[PDB]
Write an enzyme that holds these catalytic residues in place. Structure first.
Site, PDB file in Angstrom:
ATOM      1  N   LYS A  33      65.043  25.070 -16.338  1.00 61.13           N
ATOM      2  CA  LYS A  33      65.348  23.893 -15.841  1.00 61.13           C
ATOM      3  C   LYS A  33      64.614  23.795 -14.385  1.00 61.13           C
ATOM      4  O   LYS A  33      64.147  22.595 -14.012  1.00 61.13           O
ATOM      5  CB  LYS A  33      66.721  23.283 -15.373  1.00 61.13           C
ATOM      6  CG  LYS A  33      67.505  24.154 -14.498  1.00 61.13           C
ATOM      7  CD  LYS A  33      69.119  23.911 -14.179  1.00 61.13           C
ATOM      8  CE  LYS A  33      69.818  24.199 -15.629  1.00 61.13           C
ATOM      9  NZ  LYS A  33      70.006  25.569 -15.668  1.00 61.13           N
ATOM     10  N   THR A  34      64.536  24.580 -13.323  1.00 55.31           N
ATOM     11  CA  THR A  34      64.107  24.774 -12.007  1.00 55.31           C
ATOM     12  C   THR A  34      63.364  23.799 -11.477  1.00 55.31           C
ATOM     13  O   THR A  34      63.533  22.875 -11.052  1.00 55.31           O
ATOM     14  CB  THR A  34      63.733  26.169 -11.777  1.00 55.31           C
ATOM     15  OG1 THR A  34      62.584  26.379 -12.166  1.00 55.31           O
ATOM     16  CG2 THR A  34      64.890  27.257 -12.113  1.00 55.31           C
ATOM     17  N   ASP A 223      63.546  10.425 -27.920  1.00 55.30           N
ATOM     18  CA  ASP A 223      64.424  11.635 -27.742  1.00 55.30           C
ATOM     19  C   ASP A 223      65.056  11.948 -29.090  1.00 55.30           C
ATOM     20  O   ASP A 223      65.587  10.786 -29.733  1.00 55.30           O
ATOM     21  CB  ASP A 223      65.560  11.676 -26.491  1.00 55.30           C
ATOM     22  CG  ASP A 223      65.117  11.497 -25.448  1.00 55.30           C
ATOM     23  OD1 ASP A 223      63.710  11.914 -25.033  1.00 55.30           O
ATOM     24  OD2 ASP A 223      65.484  10.897 -24.500  1.00 55.30           O
ATOM     25  N   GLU A 224      64.952  12.964 -29.866  1.00 56.69           N
ATOM     26  CA  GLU A 224      65.567  13.474 -31.004  1.00 56.69           C
ATOM     27  C   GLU A 224      64.812  12.373 -32.203  1.00 56.69           C
ATOM     28  O   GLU A 224      65.680  11.474 -32.895  1.00 56.69           O
ATOM     29  CB  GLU A 224      67.040  13.216 -30.897  1.00 56.69           C
ATOM     30  CG  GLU A 224      67.871  14.191 -30.050  1.00 56.69           C
ATOM     31  CD  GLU A 224      67.383  15.839 -30.495  1.00 56.69           C
ATOM     32  OE1 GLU A 224      67.452  16.043 -31.603  1.00 56.69           O
ATOM     33  OE2 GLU A 224      67.220  16.402 -29.516  1.00 56.69           O
ATOM     34  N   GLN A 261      66.405  18.815 -37.847  1.00 62.34           N
ATOM     35  CA  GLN A 261      67.775  18.312 -37.572  1.00 62.34           C
ATOM     36  C   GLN A 261      68.285  17.044 -38.182  1.00 62.34           C
ATOM     37  O   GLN A 261      69.128  16.459 -37.478  1.00 62.34           O
ATOM     38  CB  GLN A 261      67.787  18.320 -36.064  1.00 62.34           C
ATOM     39  CG  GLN A 261      67.637  19.586 -35.373  1.00 62.34           C
ATOM     40  CD  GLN A 261      68.277  19.513 -33.994  1.00 62.34           C
ATOM     41  OE1 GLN A 261      68.786  20.372 -33.207  1.00 62.34           O
ATOM     42  NE2 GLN A 261      67.883  18.606 -33.091  1.00 62.34           N
ATOM     43  N   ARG A 629      73.022  22.752 -29.911  1.00 64.44           N
ATOM     44  CA  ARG A 629      73.349  21.716 -28.669  1.00 64.44           C
ATOM     45  C   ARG A 629      74.109  22.248 -27.592  1.00 64.44           C
ATOM     46  O   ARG A 629      74.289  22.058 -26.583  1.00 64.44           O
ATOM     47  CB  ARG A 629      73.775  20.479 -29.210  1.00 64.44           C
ATOM     48  CG  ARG A 629      72.962  19.733 -29.966  1.00 64.44           C
ATOM     49  CD  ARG A 629      71.830  18.850 -29.168  1.00 64.44           C
ATOM     50  NE  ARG A 629      70.463  19.941 -29.063  1.00 64.44           N
ATOM     51  CZ  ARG A 629      69.512  20.046 -29.935  1.00 64.44           C
ATOM     52  NH1 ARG A 629      69.685  19.534 -31.186  1.00 64.44           N
ATOM     53  NH2 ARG A 629      68.627  21.054 -29.484  1.00 64.44           N
TER      54      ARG A 629
END
Length: 674
Positions: A33-34, A223-224, A261, A629
């Site tokens: 994440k940084t 997203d997804e 998924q 997740r």
DNA sequence: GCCCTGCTGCCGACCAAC
DNA sequence: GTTGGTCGGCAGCAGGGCTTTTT
């Protein structure tokens, strides 16, 4: 702003903030994440002077939008909140309020059917045509109707499918679809598929809405993308592919997710969508990313085992820097109730000291043995229990009733609430809300629909010419309608409460379950006014908050008063209470630490999917998504004995478990003696 | 183990006509 | 005066009836 834009994986890069280059993530970890989160997305979306009328995102239920709001305001600090990620329906409605009646005669106040309305739809489809309540399952009938609406096809094709495509299955699906389409034309009711179809129609037919949606939305958050339906993909290709200057590839791209998924095909999710994406999106820039910087190596090993263990899984390998911590600790139990006892005891021993108290740690289950077990062992532990979609919430009424009165306030087109009670034997019983509701004009020579609909004792001779079955109908809502069409909202609701005495019919009257309804309508009045704490809905929480009113258009007021579904308040750090929730409420939610009570061969592999092969693959990918997740610490358990209502069914530890290495699916580290 | 849920239903004026 | 059918409510009443999941 430009000091945190390199260092780690592209995973949360093409998920959160600031960089260029096109986008198609083949999902890896999404952990680092940084600067990762800091370095793709808002800059991608704003790279070409692209604003709110030029930006759109994808949400079915906006819980995913709320979660990304939380992530951005936490690790970024605000950006997402003002930026346009709410739903398709936001922009769809804001521009249909101007150009909706121009298409199919659906006025800007187009009605929307709902879940309880969906159940009553199933009932009236079963009991309207030449059908029974269960001959053709109206549940799957409406599901196939929604599928057809996504495909945007007339019922005529599958009606002619008799001896062409089918003999009775597709023909009957098209028959009920035709009946419901006639009902829609007569009622102007819409849903998500109907809204997207209307949007596509007002793109093709109507020019300026085309130049707005198709060309302005050259930047779109996706997203997804696995669950993106064909109608949804067609719409998004319109918004991105159909740029201002055609012949160029689709506009700047922001699509992420994991195609294999597919877990909600039985909810309507499409399966692959990758190569489907690529040909109408030549700008497809696949990003095979496999790094990881906050999730553990144990999660890595489980992910890399399941990435190839699942046959229907595009094997996207992953690698993780962090050490192998948090082996997925299970617990084999010979009873679900004993399993919940042990799990709650371990939770009490580990957490409720100073950390993890009330909200997030939850168990998703489909055999309701965990329902009684978890709540009972939580109350035995003394800690509260939380249930969101557990048991004892379907065969219990008055929630349908309260939402029915809310809808009647919005639209008096409710007749099943009148059908609930039956007035006169074989004259105003089961007939006066089934026959005349169709023709208030010529059912029996009806002069006024509410004329003979009035208690003959407290009669209204001025209007008693002809009405429902020329006898009856229990005048109950016509007075409310004529009150609503005359006064402002506050005195309207108060008059419905007391002048009509209906909330007095709830308070003073006590023989039925009435006082609970009095409380419910007091809560309704509180909702219409300012009652929520420390949180304000835009500049006007209630519909009458004219302190600084905004958007005089009725659409936003109506949605903000009619989208009251559910809530949760106790914060993330307080996660101790085992929440008893289903997979269809957490379709887009993640949790740091979870115990999963009863992951066994026959339950988390769906009972439906126990024999359904396509749904078996769907629930295998559902195990995949539930595993992947998580962030750092995900744990499971086993409950061999599960006594269902019909007959008890038993399972060993699941096949999905043993698919993962047994060391990875631990059962001895974080589940010791409590 | 309630549970939808129409069927029973039984008063109570209709409503005029008698 | 003179009254009984038939226009009118909200509730008893048994009467088989019920996956888990149900977009």
């Amino acid at each position: 702003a430009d000091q945190l834009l390199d260092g780690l994986n592209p995973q949360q890069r093409q998920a959160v903030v600031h960089e260029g280059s096109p986008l198609l993530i083949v999902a890896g970890a999404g952990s680092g994440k940084t600067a990762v989160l800091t370095r793709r997305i808002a800059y991608l979306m704003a790279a070409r002077g692209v604003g709110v009328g030029q930006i759109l995102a994808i949400t079915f239920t906006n819980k995913a939008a709320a979660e990304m709001r939380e992530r951005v305001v936490g690790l970024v600090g605000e950006k997402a909140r003002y930026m346009w990620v709410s739903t398709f329906h936001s922009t769809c409605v804001r521009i249909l309020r101007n150009q909706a009646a121009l298409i199919e005669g659906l006025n800007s106040n187009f009605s929307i059917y709902d879940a309880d309305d969906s159940r009553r739809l199933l009932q009236m489809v079963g009991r309207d045509l030449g059908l029974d309540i269960k001959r053709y399952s109206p549940r799957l009938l409406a599901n196939a109707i929604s599928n057809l609406k996504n495909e945007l096809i007339d019922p005529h094709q599958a009606l002619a499918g008799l001896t062409e495509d089918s003999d009775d299955l597709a023909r009957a699906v098209a028959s009920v679809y035709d009946e419901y389409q006639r009902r829609l034309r007569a009622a102007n009711a819409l849903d998500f598929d109907d809204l997207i179809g209307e949007t596509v129609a007002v793109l093709q037919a109507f020019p300026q809405i085309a130049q707005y949606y198709r060309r302005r939305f050259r930047h779109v958050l996706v997203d997804e993308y696995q669950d993106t339906n064909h109608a949804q993909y067609v719409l998004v290709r319109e918004l991105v592919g159909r740029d201002s200057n055609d012949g160029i590839p689709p506009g700047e791209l922001c699509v992420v997710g994991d195609a294999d998924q597919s877990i909600y095909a039985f909810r309507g999710a499409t399966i692959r969508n990758i190569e489907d994406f690529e040909r109408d999106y030549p700008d497809t820039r696949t990003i095979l990313l496999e790094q990881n910087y906050r999730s553990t190596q144990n999660i890595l090993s489980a992910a890399n085992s399941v990435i190839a263990r699942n046959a229907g899984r595009r094997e996207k390998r992953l690698w993780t820097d962090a050490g192998a911590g948090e082996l997925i600790v299970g617990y084999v139990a010979d009873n679900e109730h004993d399993e919940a006892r042990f799990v709650a005891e371990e939770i009490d021993a580990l957490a409720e000291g100073s950390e993890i108290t009330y909200n997030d740690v939850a168990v998703f289950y489909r055999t309701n043995n965990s329902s009684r077990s978890l709540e009972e062992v939580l109350i035995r532990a003394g800690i509260p229990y939380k249930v969101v979609g557990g048991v004892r919430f379907y065969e219990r009424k008055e929630i349908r009733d309260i939402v029915a009165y809310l809808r009647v306030l919005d639209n008096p087109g409710d007749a099943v609430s009148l059908r609930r009670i039956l007035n006169t034997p074989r004259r105003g019983i089961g007939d006066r809300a089934e026959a005349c509701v169709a023709v208030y004009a010529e059912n029996t020579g009806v002069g006024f629909g509410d004329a003979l609909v009035a208690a003959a004792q407290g009669k209204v001779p001025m209007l008693n010419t002809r009405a429902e079955k020329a006898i009856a109908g229990f005048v109950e809502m016509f007075d409310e309608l004529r009150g609503r069409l005359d006064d402002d909202l506050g005195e309207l609701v108060e008059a419905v409460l007391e002048r009509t005495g209906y909330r007095r019919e709830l308070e003073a009257s006590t023989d039925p379950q009435e006082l609970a309804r009095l409380d419910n309508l007091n809560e309704l009045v509180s909702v219409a006014h300012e009652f929520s704490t420390d949180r304000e809905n835009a500049a006007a929480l209630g519909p009458d908050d004219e302190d600084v009113p905004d958007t005089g258009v009725l659409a936003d007021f109506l949605e903000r008063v009619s989208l009251v579904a559910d809530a949760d308040e106790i914060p993330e750090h307080g996660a101790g209470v085992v929440t008893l929730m289903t997979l269809h409420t957490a379709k887009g939610l993640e949790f740091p630490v979870v115990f999963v009570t009863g992951w066994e061969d026959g339950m988390f592999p769906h009972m439906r999917a126990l024999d359904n092969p396509t749904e078996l693959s769907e629930e295998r990918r559902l195990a995949y998504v539930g595993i992947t997740r998580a962030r750092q610490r995900l744990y499971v358990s086993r409950a061999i004995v599960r006594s269902s209502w019909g007959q008890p069914m038993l399972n060993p530890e699941s096949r999905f478990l043993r698919e993962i290495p047994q060391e990875l699916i631990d059962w001895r580290r974080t589940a010791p003696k409590p």
